[PDB]
Amino acid sequence: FEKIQIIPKSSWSSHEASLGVSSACPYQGKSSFFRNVVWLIKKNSTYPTIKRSYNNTNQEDLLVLWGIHHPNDAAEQTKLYQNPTTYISVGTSTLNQRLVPRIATRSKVNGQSGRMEFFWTILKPNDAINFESNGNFIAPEYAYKIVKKGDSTIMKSELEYGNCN
Amino acid sequence: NTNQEDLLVLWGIHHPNDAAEQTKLYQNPTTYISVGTSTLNQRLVPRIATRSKVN
Numbered sequence: 001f002e003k004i005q006i007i008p009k010s011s012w013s014s015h016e017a018s019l020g021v022s023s024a025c026p027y028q029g030k031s032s033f034f035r036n037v038v039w040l041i042k043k044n045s046t047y048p049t050i051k052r053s054y055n056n057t058n059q060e061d062l063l064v065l066w067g068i069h070h071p072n073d074a075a076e077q078t079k080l081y082q083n084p085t086t087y088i089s090v091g092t093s094t095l096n097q098r099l100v101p102r103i104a105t106r107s108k109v110n111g112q113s114g115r116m117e118f119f120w121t122i123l124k125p126n127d128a129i130n131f132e133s134n135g136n137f138i139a140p141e142y143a144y145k146i147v148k149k150g151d152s153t154i155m156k157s158e159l160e161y162g163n164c165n
Numbered sequence: 166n167t168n169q170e171d172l173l174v175l176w177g178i179h180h181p182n183d184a185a186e187q188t189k190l191y192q193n194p195t196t197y198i199s200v201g202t203s204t205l206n207q208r209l210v211p212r213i214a215t216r217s218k219v220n
């Protein structure tokens with residue numbers, strides 16, 4: 001198990017990855033966001049269609065995580081992005097999805113009203129994941145190398161480690 | 166079902182690689198496939214997305 005750079009924060013030149021946070025996740029007081037997935041915003045006032053991908057040069061197996069930002073209303077659609085209708089599609093040897101963001105009146109939680117649906121699959125050692133997005137999207141920065149053998153579970157306990165065996 | 170024994174049917178959907186192959190095979194941009202039975206009730210839209218090649 002180890003963390004890996006798939007596509008850095010730097011590589012998004014056509015889209016604004018810097019100020020992609022909100023009043024919800026405080027790092028050192030100041031407003032932050034999930035440090036392993038980047039939230040994409042329009043540049044100047046136009047949102048280019050993204051179309052990038054990742055072949056797995058690594059020989060260990062890995063998994064990717066991504067998601068969708070669901071807005072509160074059609075007014076917040078045109079504030080963050082410059083699109084009315086949006087599509088996010090992901091493609092791998094196995095996977096085949098086409099996700100549309102849902103717009104609906106919510107209730108407020110931890111500040112922000114709209115939701116954030118995440119997704120995942122495991123990418124084979126010698127295969128490519130392909131993305132395509134019009135907007136309303138949160139792309140991976142980091143992803144994990146997994147070598148799985150055998151299963152267990154999530155034990156629910158209050159205790160802490162006792163340096164034994 | 167004129168037959169008196171019970172039966173099952175199979176069908177599916179072709180998902181294209183891009184909007185260019187949409188207009189090559191078929192002459193439609195948006196497409197719908199709907200199936201209806203006493204129980205079943207579905208409306209299937211083909212997903213377009215960049216894939217990897219297999220076979």
Ligand SMILES: *[C@@H]1O[C@H](CO)[C@@H](O[C@@H]2O[C@H](CO)[C@@H](O)[C@H](O)[C@H]2NC(C)=O)[C@H](O)[C@H]1NC(C)=O
Pocket residue numbers: 055056057126127128217
């Ligand atoms: C994933 O990345 C690598 C990029 O090099 C590909 O690996 C080789 O590609 C060659 C040339 O077409 C093929 O003979 C084999 O698939 C690999 N062979 C050797 C000798 O290295 C790989 O095909 C890419 N695959 C996908 C699905 O993206």
Ligand SMILES: *[C@H]1O[C@H](CO)[C@@H](O[C@@H]2O[C@H](CO)[C@@H](O)[C@H](O)[C@H]2NC(C)=O)[C@H](O)[C@H]1NC(C)=O
Pocket residue numbers: 044045046
């Ligand atoms: C967004 O704003 C920028 C301003 O910096 C626009 O860029 C300029 O466009 C005008 C009209 O052609 C000219 O001053 C130059 O061609 C560009 N200026 C520079 C400094 O490069 C930009 O056109 C606007 N974006 C869009 C998509 O229209």
